[PDB]
Amino acid sequence: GVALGATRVIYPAGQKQEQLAVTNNDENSTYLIQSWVENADGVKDGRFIVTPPLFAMKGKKENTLRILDATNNQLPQDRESLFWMNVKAIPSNTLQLAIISRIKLYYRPAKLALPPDQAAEKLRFRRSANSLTLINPTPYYLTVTELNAGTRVLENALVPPMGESTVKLPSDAGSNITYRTINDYGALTPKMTGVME
Amino acid sequence: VNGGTVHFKGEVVNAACAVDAGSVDQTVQLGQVRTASLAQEGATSSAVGFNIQLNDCDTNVASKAAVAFLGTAIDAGHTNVLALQSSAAGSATNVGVQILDRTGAALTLDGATFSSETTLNNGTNTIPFQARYFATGAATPGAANADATFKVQYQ
Amino acid sequence: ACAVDAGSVDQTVQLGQVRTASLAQEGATSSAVGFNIQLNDCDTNVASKAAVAFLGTAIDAGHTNVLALQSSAAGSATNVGVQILDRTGAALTLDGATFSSETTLNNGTNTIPFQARYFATGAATPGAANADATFKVQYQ
Amino acid sequence: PQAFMSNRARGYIPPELWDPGINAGLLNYNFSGNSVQNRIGGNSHYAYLNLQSGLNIGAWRLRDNTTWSYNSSKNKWQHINTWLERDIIPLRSRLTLGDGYTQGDIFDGINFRGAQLASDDNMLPDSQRGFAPVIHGIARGTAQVTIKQNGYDIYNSTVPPGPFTINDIYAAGNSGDLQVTIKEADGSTQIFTVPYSSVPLLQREGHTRYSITAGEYRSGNAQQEKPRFFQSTLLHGLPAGWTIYGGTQLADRYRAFNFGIGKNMGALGALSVDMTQANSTLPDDSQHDGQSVRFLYNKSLNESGTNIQLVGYRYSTSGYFNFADTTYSRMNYNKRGKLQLTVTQQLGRTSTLYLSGSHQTYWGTSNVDEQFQAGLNTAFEDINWTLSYSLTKNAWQKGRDQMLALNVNIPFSHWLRSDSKSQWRHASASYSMSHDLNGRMTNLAGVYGTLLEDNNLSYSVQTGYAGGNSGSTGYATLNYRGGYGNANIGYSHSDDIKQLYYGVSGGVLAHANGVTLGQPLNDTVVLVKAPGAKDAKVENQTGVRTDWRGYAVLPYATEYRENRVALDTNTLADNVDLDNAVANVVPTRGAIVRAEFKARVGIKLLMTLTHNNKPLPFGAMVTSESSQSSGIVADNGQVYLSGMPLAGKVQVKWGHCVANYQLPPESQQQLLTQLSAECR
């Protein structure tokens, strides 16, 4: 089964090519890798072209996929943009399974008002009946994980930059809120508390 | 007699999980179709169990990855029934394969994802599923092999 | 006598990028990266042999032969450290008095090689690994 | 049963996959020069050229070392070492003819000139290296075993209903508590724990290390003679945590036999005792017979992962001398006892107190050589500070001889923001203060870091102050690790001294495909060959770029291991596409292995092919003999091609079609071109 180099590929603006490793750990396996990039709505798009789009991997081998930009500077330069990079491994009676791995491609503008470090803390919680709306003013896509409202987990949330995501909260949960966001490298930031602002 | 300092700088980067689906070539075997048994829409076959392993990755990244199944549906009503993919003399009529959940509930093939609830077996993280033939009106003695696609959203 | 060569006093070594697959369990090591310590004006008469000892903070008492990475604002990797090998390929204790293998001091320039490596104590979380060590040279 | 099954170790590489290398020359040069200007003696120029030649033909590796020294007044080419090394796979050993050294740990380090055949441990997989207990067991029924450390799991696998031996456990540090937990499908879980403590002399069960050295004895000192000698060394790891290790050192006048045993006692720790019995004829005609006993104890982790103690004692009776004392001149006080006591204690997850005490007493000369060292290193956030103290009272009236040192490292990232683009992020401030406990003060404050795109150019500017004399010594150095060599320039200013250092280091390989220059080599080297890909930087290494022909040499590659060699596609010409940007090579010790890459030099093209107004099916192969290119139709008739001419034709084999295309110069200048070309 093929594996990707990282669970989160951040492409900074101003570049042309961003590289991502695809590796095959199984020694005896022939695969056909087909990769592409979709927008935030899960629609196939030509804004990013992955090369080579379709190629044959024989046995244990590692190759590099080159994501070439075609934005023409048409994307906003204020906040991050989200895309989904899909890599499908066709194993070229029995039903055959082709695995699609989807990762987050973060188009990050070169200059931002806030460094990524302090984006995690600035996430205020709007608490009301059957709702725990998360407000994120920082221009970064926040991946809130293990949202514990006192003694119960709600779900994993992805708050858009400068946006308010919605989560349904059972009324039995306590007032205390603890969470932790996934940082740049994929690790988990140490558990922070959550204000009600 | 005295020296200075040496500093080491480097990066440790998380790696996405390697997905293994059942046997080699991501293949799961099923029992042959029974013409007599596969009579009505409710007629079924043996529910062959299999599992998908998220190996070569940490137990935290695998548990946070959403999971979905997709493919081609044979009919609009048969949403959960995979369309058989065979173009030969072995093509069967009014049959298909169904991918099930742990309990036995049908899995939607549209692409609606769900949590992985990976079980941390001594080796690695595992997610078990089942596949079973689903008659849809009649049975034909042919190899009704199909194809499905596994989607793993690495949150 | 002689002294450490200019520019080898404060040194930086880029270990690069390593993956949790390479460092997933205790004892797993990455690819070694070579680096040398240079000595100049060392005559054979004044000092026939020399060796160095690295002084650093251990990640834990159990692993005293590996270093401890410093915390960073973005985030520090967990359960991983830096280990300094020798020419023979053996680890070096980071105590101030535990010196390395002796070498013959040729008249003039003398380079002593070493290898920096990653050592994971259990599952290694992703991050940035930055470590520091202090080395002292003895002459015999 | 798993014991009978030939289960291979983790990370095992078959010996057939090992690459002997290529037949190529080798030349590593290191020129250094110091211009010293002092007001009392004008100026002077010093130069030293260190030249290590070499030749890798077949599996034999010939290496020679030479030195040239120049003063400003003559040229003196001086040989140092010449050796022909080789690795023997059936014996799992390494053979060396000519000059070299004796790697003996049971005996003392000896430089010689002869033939040495010694077992090598790097050829073993990384799993079965060092010391780690082997787990023997019998499982009733098919079970699953999870050998887990005090912190986390280590070895999880499945064991059939029978005997099973597991020897893949990693070193896991000096001490460890391995809990073996077997879970049967039917019966209840069975758990048992084993603690272990390691000593360098200990070996794994059924592990043998041997060394046979013969030939003349070579030493730097002119007084010592050159007698012939033989030296055998054996280290065997017995079952149940024992180690038997012995040796024999023989010559014309010196005959020594060493025998010793080591033990892993578990919770108590580790032990090693050996006795060496030596009959030595001194430089004079007098003969002396003696014995020396070496004791070594390693305590386990006291408290809870806080303290470790090492006690090394050595008692040498009157009449035991090493090989040097025998090999002294025809005409030219022994150590009664040496005690070493090392205590390491970790506190607060930050500070690591290291205490070392050496105590050596001689015969007749009752004066003792006491040496106390107390180091304390702490790492609070980015700040890394260290306070050290030393105290030496030796036999030759060294007095108190105390010393105190304080070293602080402060990265500038402690203040700079995380995503700062300024070059100040790769910088640090180092401050060192030294007292001699006598008023002798030494301050040294400075900055250092890297200031190039690839972090090649490493700069270090440090001022200082030595006070009793009051000398403010400035110091500046710039090192540059480029794709052709390492160039360093330094300026050391003092009260009345100005030194200017300048040096160039490099390596040259005269391989079958011509001469390739690069950074100075270090044992194994990997020759990356990607012709047509000029100035392409390789990954994970600083300043290693391909030359104008596409050939580059990597300084270091791990021996007998799977190491990745990747070309950074980001910093590569937009006209070139690599078929494979990552390669894997498994080199042998001192081997030159070629990591060959295929690079297409033509424009990168993406074609939409329609046959009878219908897109080509998935999986069809589109090739082109006009430039030897191939690709696979992805979907909607979209195919990707690399290395294509401007006007050309491709052929598609779905299960025989031809498609013609032409492109504008703006399209050839474009990074990736996209066109549509109906097929026949």
Author numbering:
A (entry chain C): 1 to 92, 101 to 205
B (entry chain A): 5 to 159
C (entry chain B): 20 to 159
D (entry chain D): 116 to 187, 194 to 453, 478 to 613, 617 to 803, 809 to 833
Paper text:
Uropathogenic Escherichia coli strains use filamentous type 1 pili to adhere to and invade uroepithelial cells. The pilus consists of a flexible tip fibrillum, formed by the adhesin FimH and the subunits FimG and FimF. The pilus rod is a helical assembly of up to 3000 copies of the main subunit FimA, terminated by a single copy of the subunit FimI that anchors the rod to the assembly platform FimD in the outer membrane. The assembly platform FimD in the outer membrane of uropathogenic E. coli is the catalyst of type 1 pilus assembly.
On the periplasmic side of FimD, the FimAn-FimC complex is bound to the CTDs, while the preceding subunit, FimAn-1, occupies the pore of the usher. The NTD is unoccupied and not well-resolved. The overall arrangement of the subunits FimAn, FimAn-1 and FimC in the FimDHGFAnC complex is similar to that observed for conformer 2 of the FimD-tip complex FimDHGFC (PDB-ID 6E159), but subtle upward displacements relative to the transmembrane domain of FimD are observed for several subunits. Specifically, subunit FimAn is positioned about 4.5 Å higher than FimF, FimC is moved upwards by roughly 8 Å, and CTD2 of FimD is shifted upwards by approximately 4 Å. This previously unknown FimD conformation appears to be specific to FimD-rod complexes, in which another notable change occurs in the orientation of the Nte of the FimAn-2 subunit emerging from the usher pore. This adjustment appears to still be constrained by the upper rim of the usher, preventing FimA from adopting its final orientation found in the pilus rod.
